[PDB]
Amino acid sequence: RKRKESYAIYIYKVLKQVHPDTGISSKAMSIMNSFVNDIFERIAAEASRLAHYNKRSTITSREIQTAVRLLLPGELAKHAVSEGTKAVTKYTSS
Amino acid sequence: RKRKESYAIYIYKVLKQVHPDTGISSKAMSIMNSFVNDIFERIAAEASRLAHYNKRSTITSREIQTAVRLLLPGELAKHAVSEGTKAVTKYTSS
Amino acid sequence: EVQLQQSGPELVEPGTSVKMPCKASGYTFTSYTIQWVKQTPRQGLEWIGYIYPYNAGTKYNEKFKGKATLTSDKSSSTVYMELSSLTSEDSAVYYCARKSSRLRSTLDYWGQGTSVTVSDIKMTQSPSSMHASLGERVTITCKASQDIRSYLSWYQQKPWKSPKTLIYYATSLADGVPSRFSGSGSGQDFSLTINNLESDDTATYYCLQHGESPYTFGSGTKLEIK
Amino acid sequence: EVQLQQSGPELVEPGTSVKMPCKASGYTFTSYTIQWVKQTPRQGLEWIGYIYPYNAGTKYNEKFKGKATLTSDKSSSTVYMELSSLTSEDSAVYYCARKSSRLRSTLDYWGQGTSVTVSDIKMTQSPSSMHASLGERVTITCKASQDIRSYLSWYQQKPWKSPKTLIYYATSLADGVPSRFSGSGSGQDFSLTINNLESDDTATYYCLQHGESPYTFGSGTKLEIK
Amino acid sequence: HRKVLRDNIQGITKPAIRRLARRGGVKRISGLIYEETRGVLKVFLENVIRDAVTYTEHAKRKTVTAMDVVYALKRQGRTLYGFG
Amino acid sequence: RKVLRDNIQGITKPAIRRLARRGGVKRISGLIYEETRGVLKVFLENVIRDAVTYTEHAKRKTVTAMDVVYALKRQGRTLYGFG
Amino acid sequence: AKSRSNRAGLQFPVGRIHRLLRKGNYAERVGAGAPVYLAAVMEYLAAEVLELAGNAARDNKKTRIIPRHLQLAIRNDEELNKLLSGVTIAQGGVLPNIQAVLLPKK
Amino acid sequence: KAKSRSNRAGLQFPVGRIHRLLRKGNYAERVGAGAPVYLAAVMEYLAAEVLELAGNAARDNKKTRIIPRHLQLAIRNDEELNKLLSGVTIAQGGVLPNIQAVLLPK
Amino acid sequence: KPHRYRPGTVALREIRRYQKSTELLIRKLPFQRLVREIAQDFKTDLRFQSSAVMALQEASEAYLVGLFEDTNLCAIHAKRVTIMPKDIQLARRIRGER
Amino acid sequence: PHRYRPGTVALREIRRYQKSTELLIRKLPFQRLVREIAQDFKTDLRFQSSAVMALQEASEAYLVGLFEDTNLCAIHAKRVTIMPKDIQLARRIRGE
DNA sequence: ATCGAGAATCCCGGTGCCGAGGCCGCTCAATTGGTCGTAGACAGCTCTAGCACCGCTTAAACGCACGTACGCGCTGTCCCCCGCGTTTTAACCGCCAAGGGGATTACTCCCTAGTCTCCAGGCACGTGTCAGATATATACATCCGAT
DNA sequence: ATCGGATGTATATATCTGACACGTGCCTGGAGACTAGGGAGTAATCCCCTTGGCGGTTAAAACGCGGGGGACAGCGCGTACGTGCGTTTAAGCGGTGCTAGAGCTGTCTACGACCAATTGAGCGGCCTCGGCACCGGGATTCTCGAT
C-alpha cells in the first residue's frame, strides 16, 4: 500500500465540470489515466528533443508549445495552444 | 570552425580492418555516420526506458544488453551481445 | 484561403426538389463538418443540420427531419443539400458554414449564400436595435434559457452579405478580428462589447449557442452609426 | 528446437536426376541461408553452395555450376537440391546445413544426410591422426593458404552421423558445447584444443573456412581415444 | 511436475476466427483462412511474448506482469490503454 | 519575392512514369498522374509543416536540412545521408 | 498555501507534473511555465475526450462512461483518430461498419 | 601514462566520447562504467557488419569505393538488417532489382 | 417445410451483432494455454498475472480484427466477397509484416 | 520500320530505373513546388540547398515505395495496369 | 408487387447486486522562503550562402497518330461455403489449498559524480594523385517479323 | 522452331578531373587521481496471488448434409495506353553580384536548482445504495417463399 498515484481524481473533477451528472467506470477511468500519461510522455519527449536540437538545457513553455503544435493534429493544436497560453498568462499574474 | 565531431575516423578504422583495400565516399561516410548515431540513440533510449521502468537511476551494461536484445533482430542480437560482453570482460581486466 | 463556394440564385415552383452545392476548398475537407443555416426576413437565422464527411454522419434539426437531406461527395469536395416538398415556408437564403468537430469551435467560415425563391433553448438579445455615435462603447446581451457553459458565438452580418465570425467560446476572438470586439459572460447571460466604433461597424449582430444539440441563433441587433 | 530433416537412402541410375528436400522447421525460415555440403569418403567434405530463402539468392561452387541447382519453397519450409547428369563422381552423402546471413555465423545445424548411390584457399590440417589418453590435451591445427581473418569453424563428425559444430569465429564456443573444447588463432594459424578427453570424443575433426567465396573444409583428423 | 503444453494453436477454433472476421466485417470466409490466421496470430504472439519475457527477466522476476505486456506492445507501435 | 501558383504540374507525367518504372510498374492508367500529384502534395505538406515548425522554434528564417531530417524522423520516414 | 493548479485555473496537478518533468530525464532544468502549459494541454485533451464520451453515453441512455463510449468518441472523430491511431482501447470494440457491396442488392 | 578506454576495451570506437554522450544526453541520472564499453562494442559490431557487406557488394560491382548504392544493396539483401532499417531511407541508394513474374512476357 | 435463411443473411446479422459487442471473441482458457505454450520457448517456469493474459488477448484480438478489416478490402478490390489467404498475405505485406 | 511490342520498352525502363540511383524528378520544378507549399506556413521563407535535396530524396522514396504497393494491388486484382483504386487501397492498408 | 408466417430484434417493467462514489485518517509531497550560480537573452559583428538574374545549349517534355492487347462485361459450370440440426466436448464457475515469489525494509559499501590538471586525440585546413566518369569503338544478346 | 535485321546493352581502351586519403598544427576534451555520498546489492520477512485440482452445467464446438450462389475460366469487343516521331520549352550550367541571416563572442541578470520547515492534498481503507445486467413478456420489423 504505497500510494500508486494516478490521475483519477483530476479526471473526475474534469468530468464533473463537463458532464455534472455523468459518472465513469473503473475500466474507463483506467483508459483515461493511460491516455493522460500517454500524451504527457509524448509532449515531454518532443519538448526534450526540441531542447536538445537547439543546444538548450531548459524545457520551457515555448518548447511545450512547439511540441503541442508538432504532435496534435489540426484544430486540436489550435485550442490546446490557447488553453496553455491562457493558463501561463493567468499563472504569471499569481 | 566549431569542431563538428563525427564518427567518420572510427568508421574508417573499422573499414580499414575489415576491407584494407576498399575506401568509402563522403556520401556513404555520411550515411554510415547517420547509421551509427541512429543505433546509438535507439539503444540509449531503450536502456533509459528500462531503467525508468525498473526504478533505477543508473544505465549499466545490463540495461544496454537488454536494450540490444529488444532492438536487434535475430542473430544480430546474438553476436552484438557477444561483442559487448567480450569488450566489458576485457575492459575490467584493464 | 478557406472558401466555401456556393451556387447562384434560383427560382423553383412549389412541389419541386432542389439541390444546392457547397463546394469547399482551401482546407482538409473531411476534418470539418459542414453546417447548413437558413435565413428568412421573418424568422432570422435558423440551423438546419450538419454532415461530417469523415464518416458521412449527419444530424438534423427536429423541425427539418425529413424536410432537408444532406449528402457529401468526398472526391468532389462538395456537400449537397436537397429540399423536399417546397412549401411557401421555404423562401430563404441558405448558407453553408464550416465548423470543426471540436466542441469549442464555431461556424468558422461561411459560403456566399443562395436565395431560394418559391412561387429547445431560446436566445434573448435584449437590445433589438441600437443607435450609437462613432466613438461609443456598445454592449449587447444574449441571455439564455438553459445553461450553456460558454459555448456561445457572436456573428456580424452586413446587409446582403454572409455572416462573419467575431467571437467564439464566449470570450475568444476569431481570426482576423481586431481587439475592438470583446466578449464576456458564462452560464446564461453573455455580452458582446465593441470598444470604439467605426464606419464598417454597421451590421446586425447574432449570438449562436452550441450547448445543446439543436443549435439556436439570436433574434438580431441592428446597429446604426449616427 | 531446430530440425533440418532429410530423405532416406537412395540408389539411382546414371544419366538421371535426383531431387532431395531439406524440410527445415523450428526457426524463421527466410532469415537463414541453407548450405549444401557433399561428403565422399575419398575427398572429405566439399561445399556445393547455398540458397537464401529471403530473395532466392544462390551461390555455387564453380566446380558445381551446372551440376547442381538449388530452389526454395517458402510455403512448405523446404529447400530442394537437384543434381543433373549423374556421373560416377556423385556417390556421396549430401547434407544440408543451416547458416545465418551473419558473416560471423557458421553452419550451425545439420541434416542427417542422404545416401546417394549411382549405378582458392586450402585448409591443411597438420595432424592426420591422433592417439591420446582419457585426461590428455590434444591440439589440432588448421594451417591456411591465404589470410582469412577469424572466419574459421571447427566441426566434429562421429562415424556415420552428421557433423556437429564446436567452435565458430575461431574462438567462440557453439551452443551446448562444453568448455573442454577451445579454439585459438587468427590469420593463417588456427588451433583446436580439447582438454580432458572422454570416450565420446572419438571423431573426425574438420576445420571450415568461410572467409572467402568457395568455402573449403579441411582434410580431417581422426582422433583415437585409447 | 511441470506442465509442458503442445499444439494449442488449434484451441483458436474455426468459430472463433469466424467471430473475429464478423467483427472485421467479413461476409464470406474461405476454408483455408483458418490455418493462415493461426499462423499470423502465432507470429504476432511470439513477437510480443519474446519482448515481454525480456522485460520480465531484466527485472529479475519470474512473473510476467501486465506492465511487461504493455511495454512489449508499446515499442511495437501497438499502445494498449486500460491496463496501466 | 513573388507568390508562386500551381507548381504541382511541374511533377510531369514522364517523371511519374519514371517513379513507377523504379517501382516496377509496367502499365499505367491515365488517371494515375493526378492521384499521384495529390498524394505527393499531401506528403510534402505534412513534412514541410513540421520542418517549418522546427525552423521557427529555433527563431531562424532558413529551413536547414536538419529540420527536414527531424520532420521526417518524427513521421517514421528516417533519412540517412544529410546529418 | 495556494496550489499552482488553483493559481493557473486548472484541475490537473501543476506541481506533480513539475516533479514528473524534473525527474523524467527530459532536460537539465525545467522552467516555471512548462508544467502550467502541459497541465493545461492535458486538461484540455481529457475534457474533449470525456465530453464526447459523455455525449455518446447519453445517446445510449446511460449515465456512466464505459470503454465503448470512449472508443466511439475517439474513432468517430478525425483529429482524435489521428492522435490515437496506433492505440488499442481495451473492451472498446469497433465502429459499426459494413461495406456496401456486402449488402443484398435490390 | 594515459591509455584510452577504447584500447583498454580493444575497440575502434570512442568509449570516452560515448560516455560523455550518455552523460550529457538525458538518459539517466547516473551512467555505469561498462555501459559505454558495451555500447561502443555493439556500435562497432553493427558498423563492421554493414561495412563488410557493403564492401563485398562493391567488389562484386568491380569497384573499390563504397558508394550509397552498395550500402543499400547490403542492407536490403539481408533479412535482419532490413528488419533493423525498415523505416529508413538511404539517400542516393536506389532500390533492389525486382520485377514481378506476371509482368514478364511469355 | 422448415424455415431457412438464404446464404448471407445470418452472416450479415452476426456482422451487426459482433460489431456492436465489446467482448472477447476467443475463449479464455485456450488462449491462456497458447500464451503459456509460446512462452515456454523463451524462459522455462514462467508465471503470468491474470491481467497479463487479458492484455495479450485484447491486443491479439484487436490485431486480428484490424487485419480482417484490411483483408476484406483486398478481397473487395479483387471483385470478390470471400476472403482468401492471398488477401491476408497482400494486406500483411502492404502493412509491412511480410 | 522497326517497332517494339507494347510492354517491351516498359520492362526495359523498369530494368533501367531499378539499376540507377538518380533523382527522377527535375530539380527546379520540385524546388518551386517546395517553396510554394512552404508559403502557406510562413512568408518569405528560405531553404538551404540541402533541405530541398533531403525533401526530394524522401519524396521520391515515398512515391517509389507507394508504387510498389500499388503494383501489388493491381496484380492482386488480376490486372497489370495500376489505377487510382489501387493507389487508394494501398494507402488505406498502410494507414494514410 | 402485396402478403402472411416465422424468426429476430427491440422495448418495457421488475428485481438483485456489486461497483462507483463519497467519507475519514494520515503521511508525505508540494509549497514557501532565501541563496547562489549558471543558462540564456540581447547587442554586435563578420562572413557564408542563398537568392536573383542572364544567356546558351540541348535534353526532356509535349503533342499527335496508330494499333494492339488488355480491361471489362457476359455467360456457364461446378463446387465450396453457408445455414441448420444433432451430438459431444471442454469452458466456466464456484470452492479450496499450498507455496512461490513480489514487494518492502534495513544496512553496508562500492561505484559514480564532481573537481582539477595535463596532454594527446581528433578536427580544420591544405594537398597531390588515382578511382571513377565519360567518350568511343566493338561484340554479344535480345526482340520481332517472316517463314 | 529457326533465321536474320535492327536495336540495345555489355566490354575494353584512353584520358581527365575532383574527391579522397593523408599530413600538420593546435586546442579542448578525455584520462588520471582523489573525495564524498548515496544507489543498489543482499539478506530477511511477509502475505498476496498464482497454480493446481475437482465437480456439475451448459453453451459452444464439431460434424454431417443439402443446396445455392459465387468463384473462376472462356470468349468477345472496344478503348485506352504504349511506342515512336517531330516540334517546343524549360532545366541545367556557368558566371556574377548582393545582402540577409547564421553563427559566434561578450556581458549581465533573472531564473531555476537546492535546501530546510510546514501543512494540507491525495491516497488507502471502508461502507452504502443505485445504475445496470438480467429475466420474462409482449410489440414491432425484417426476411422469404408461394402467389
PDB file of C-alpha atoms in Angstrom, chain C residues 26-152:
ATOM      1  CA  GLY C  26      -8.510  25.507 -49.143  1.00  0.00           C
ATOM      2  CA  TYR C  27      -8.562  23.011 -46.268  1.00  0.00           C
ATOM      3  CA  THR C  28      -8.694  19.305 -45.491  1.00  0.00           C
ATOM      4  CA  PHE C  29     -12.280  18.501 -46.397  1.00  0.00           C
ATOM      5  CA  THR C  30     -13.072  15.559 -44.120  1.00  0.00           C
ATOM      6  CA  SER C  31     -11.820  17.165 -40.883  1.00  0.00           C
ATOM      7  CA  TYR C  32     -14.602  19.748 -40.626  1.00  0.00           C
ATOM      8  CA  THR C  33     -18.352  19.301 -40.512  1.00  0.00           C
ATOM      9  CA  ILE C  34     -20.336  21.465 -42.910  1.00  0.00           C
ATOM     10  CA  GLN C  35     -23.298  23.188 -41.274  1.00  0.00           C
ATOM     11  CA  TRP C  36     -26.419  24.471 -43.034  1.00  0.00           C
ATOM     12  CA  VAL C  37     -28.263  27.583 -41.833  1.00  0.00           C
ATOM     13  CA  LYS C  38     -31.299  29.245 -43.427  1.00  0.00           C
ATOM     14  CA  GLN C  39     -32.126  32.938 -43.163  1.00  0.00           C
ATOM     15  CA  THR C  40     -35.563  34.490 -43.597  1.00  0.00           C
ATOM     16  CA  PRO C  41     -36.559  38.135 -43.069  1.00  0.00           C
ATOM     17  CA  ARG C  42     -39.479  36.823 -40.961  1.00  0.00           C
ATOM     18  CA  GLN C  43     -37.691  34.438 -38.558  1.00  0.00           C
ATOM     19  CA  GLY C  44     -33.994  35.226 -38.891  1.00  0.00           C
ATOM     20  CA  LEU C  45     -31.241  32.652 -38.794  1.00  0.00           C
ATOM     21  CA  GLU C  46     -32.007  29.010 -38.090  1.00  0.00           C
ATOM     22  CA  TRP C  47     -29.815  25.913 -38.039  1.00  0.00           C
ATOM     23  CA  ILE C  48     -30.889  23.070 -40.335  1.00  0.00           C
ATOM     24  CA  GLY C  49     -28.241  20.420 -39.766  1.00  0.00           C
ATOM     25  CA  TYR C  50     -24.695  19.305 -40.419  1.00  0.00           C
ATOM     26  CA  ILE C  51     -22.866  16.471 -42.118  1.00  0.00           C
ATOM     27  CA  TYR C  52     -19.456  15.144 -41.145  1.00  0.00           C
ATOM     28  CA  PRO C  53     -17.644  13.988 -44.324  1.00  0.00           C
ATOM     29  CA  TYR C  54     -15.317  11.751 -42.281  1.00  0.00           C
ATOM     30  CA  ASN C  55     -17.967   9.137 -41.507  1.00  0.00           C
ATOM     31  CA  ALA C  56     -20.810  10.558 -43.683  1.00  0.00           C
ATOM     32  CA  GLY C  57     -22.683  11.194 -40.453  1.00  0.00           C
ATOM     33  CA  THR C  58     -25.452  13.764 -40.391  1.00  0.00           C
ATOM     34  CA  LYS C  59     -27.565  15.293 -37.650  1.00  0.00           C
ATOM     35  CA  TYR C  60     -30.679  17.337 -38.348  1.00  0.00           C
ATOM     36  CA  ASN C  61     -32.954  19.756 -36.581  1.00  0.00           C
ATOM     37  CA  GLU C  62     -36.173  18.117 -35.433  1.00  0.00           C
ATOM     38  CA  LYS C  63     -38.000  20.897 -37.325  1.00  0.00           C
ATOM     39  CA  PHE C  64     -36.273  19.736 -40.529  1.00  0.00           C
ATOM     40  CA  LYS C  65     -36.093  15.945 -40.098  1.00  0.00           C
ATOM     41  CA  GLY C  66     -37.396  14.543 -43.371  1.00  0.00           C
ATOM     42  CA  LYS C  67     -37.696  18.030 -44.889  1.00  0.00           C
ATOM     43  CA  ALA C  68     -33.984  18.614 -45.560  1.00  0.00           C
ATOM     44  CA  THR C  69     -31.489  15.934 -46.555  1.00  0.00           C
ATOM     45  CA  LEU C  70     -27.708  16.291 -46.610  1.00  0.00           C
ATOM     46  CA  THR C  71     -25.173  14.335 -48.667  1.00  0.00           C
ATOM     47  CA  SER C  72     -21.462  14.800 -49.304  1.00  0.00           C
ATOM     48  CA  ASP C  73     -19.143  13.756 -52.113  1.00  0.00           C
ATOM     49  CA  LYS C  74     -15.561  13.335 -50.927  1.00  0.00           C
ATOM     50  CA  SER C  75     -13.825  13.284 -54.318  1.00  0.00           C
ATOM     51  CA  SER C  76     -15.726  16.412 -55.361  1.00  0.00           C
ATOM     52  CA  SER C  77     -15.034  18.159 -52.008  1.00  0.00           C
ATOM     53  CA  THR C  78     -18.703  19.066 -52.216  1.00  0.00           C
ATOM     54  CA  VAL C  79     -21.704  18.838 -49.902  1.00  0.00           C
ATOM     55  CA  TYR C  80     -25.162  18.683 -51.459  1.00  0.00           C
ATOM     56  CA  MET C  81     -28.280  19.663 -49.539  1.00  0.00           C
ATOM     57  CA  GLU C  82     -31.688  18.854 -51.002  1.00  0.00           C
ATOM     58  CA  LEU C  83     -35.047  20.388 -50.108  1.00  0.00           C
ATOM     59  CA  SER C  84     -38.188  18.271 -50.398  1.00  0.00           C
ATOM     60  CA  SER C  85     -41.804  19.463 -50.745  1.00  0.00           C
ATOM     61  CA  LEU C  86     -41.081  23.143 -51.410  1.00  0.00           C
ATOM     62  CA  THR C  87     -43.794  24.998 -49.494  1.00  0.00           C
ATOM     63  CA  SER C  88     -44.260  28.775 -49.214  1.00  0.00           C
ATOM     64  CA  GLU C  89     -42.358  28.368 -45.908  1.00  0.00           C
ATOM     65  CA  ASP C  90     -39.133  27.803 -47.873  1.00  0.00           C
ATOM     66  CA  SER C  91     -38.412  31.372 -49.036  1.00  0.00           C
ATOM     67  CA  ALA C  92     -34.977  31.915 -47.539  1.00  0.00           C
ATOM     68  CA  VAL C  93     -31.263  32.292 -48.121  1.00  0.00           C
ATOM     69  CA  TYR C  94     -29.436  29.037 -47.409  1.00  0.00           C
ATOM     70  CA  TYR C  95     -25.889  29.390 -46.086  1.00  0.00           C
ATOM     71  CA  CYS C  96     -23.383  26.601 -45.691  1.00  0.00           C
ATOM     72  CA  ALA C  97     -20.828  27.098 -42.939  1.00  0.00           C
ATOM     73  CA  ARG C  98     -17.698  25.248 -41.877  1.00  0.00           C
ATOM     74  CA  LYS C  99     -17.454  24.088 -38.257  1.00  0.00           C
ATOM     75  CA  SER C 100     -14.784  21.864 -36.782  1.00  0.00           C
ATOM     76  CA  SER C 101     -15.600  18.741 -34.838  1.00  0.00           C
ATOM     77  CA  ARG C 102     -14.094  20.486 -31.807  1.00  0.00           C
ATOM     78  CA  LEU C 103     -16.790  21.426 -29.323  1.00  0.00           C
ATOM     79  CA  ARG C 104     -15.137  24.781 -28.628  1.00  0.00           C
ATOM     80  CA  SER C 105     -15.204  25.619 -32.340  1.00  0.00           C
ATOM     81  CA  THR C 106     -17.891  27.653 -34.044  1.00  0.00           C
ATOM     82  CA  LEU C 107     -19.158  28.214 -37.578  1.00  0.00           C
ATOM     83  CA  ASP C 108     -15.795  29.461 -38.804  1.00  0.00           C
ATOM     84  CA  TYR C 109     -16.261  30.306 -42.479  1.00  0.00           C
ATOM     85  CA  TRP C 110     -19.477  30.789 -44.424  1.00  0.00           C
ATOM     86  CA  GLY C 111     -20.470  30.490 -48.046  1.00  0.00           C
ATOM     87  CA  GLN C 112     -21.864  33.007 -50.489  1.00  0.00           C
ATOM     88  CA  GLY C 113     -25.488  32.179 -49.656  1.00  0.00           C
ATOM     89  CA  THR C 114     -28.111  31.136 -52.214  1.00  0.00           C
ATOM     90  CA  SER C 115     -31.543  32.748 -52.489  1.00  0.00           C
ATOM     91  CA  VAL C 116     -34.136  30.000 -52.935  1.00  0.00           C
ATOM     92  CA  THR C 117     -37.380  31.581 -54.094  1.00  0.00           C
ATOM     93  CA  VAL C 118     -40.591  29.602 -54.141  1.00  0.00           C
ATOM     94  CA  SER C 119     -43.518  30.931 -56.174  1.00  0.00           C
ATOM     95  CA  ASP C 120     -35.025  23.711 -27.136  1.00  0.00           C
ATOM     96  CA  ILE C 121     -33.077  26.766 -25.949  1.00  0.00           C
ATOM     97  CA  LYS C 122     -34.118  30.305 -26.884  1.00  0.00           C
ATOM     98  CA  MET C 123     -31.609  33.175 -27.057  1.00  0.00           C
ATOM     99  CA  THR C 124     -32.752  36.645 -25.998  1.00  0.00           C
ATOM    100  CA  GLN C 125     -30.905  39.657 -27.407  1.00  0.00           C
ATOM    101  CA  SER C 126     -32.084  42.484 -25.174  1.00  0.00           C
ATOM    102  CA  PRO C 127     -31.436  45.483 -27.460  1.00  0.00           C
ATOM    103  CA  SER C 128     -33.235  44.705 -30.702  1.00  0.00           C
ATOM    104  CA  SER C 129     -31.889  47.850 -32.367  1.00  0.00           C
ATOM    105  CA  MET C 130     -29.275  50.369 -31.372  1.00  0.00           C
ATOM    106  CA  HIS C 131     -28.090  53.806 -32.372  1.00  0.00           C
ATOM    107  CA  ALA C 132     -24.647  54.963 -31.314  1.00  0.00           C
ATOM    108  CA  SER C 133     -22.060  57.618 -32.061  1.00  0.00           C
ATOM    109  CA  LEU C 134     -18.816  56.944 -33.929  1.00  0.00           C
ATOM    110  CA  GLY C 135     -16.781  56.551 -30.728  1.00  0.00           C
ATOM    111  CA  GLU C 136     -19.102  54.927 -28.189  1.00  0.00           C
ATOM    112  CA  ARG C 137     -18.673  51.656 -26.287  1.00  0.00           C
ATOM    113  CA  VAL C 138     -21.567  49.276 -27.024  1.00  0.00           C
ATOM    114  CA  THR C 139     -22.823  46.272 -25.032  1.00  0.00           C
ATOM    115  CA  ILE C 140     -25.177  43.642 -26.465  1.00  0.00           C
ATOM    116  CA  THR C 141     -26.555  40.930 -24.172  1.00  0.00           C
ATOM    117  CA  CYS C 142     -27.583  37.354 -25.069  1.00  0.00           C
ATOM    118  CA  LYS C 143     -29.436  35.971 -22.021  1.00  0.00           C
ATOM    119  CA  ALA C 144     -30.062  32.240 -22.472  1.00  0.00           C
ATOM    120  CA  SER C 145     -32.867  29.900 -21.404  1.00  0.00           C
ATOM    121  CA  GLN C 146     -30.946  26.834 -20.215  1.00  0.00           C
ATOM    122  CA  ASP C 147     -27.349  26.830 -19.073  1.00  0.00           C
ATOM    123  CA  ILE C 148     -24.734  26.615 -21.809  1.00  0.00           C
ATOM    124  CA  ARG C 149     -21.251  26.565 -20.381  1.00  0.00           C
ATOM    125  CA  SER C 150     -19.521  29.202 -22.535  1.00  0.00           C
ATOM    126  CA  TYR C 151     -20.495  27.556 -25.854  1.00  0.00           C
ATOM    127  CA  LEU C 152     -21.611  30.797 -27.430  1.00  0.00           C
TER     128      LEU C 152
END
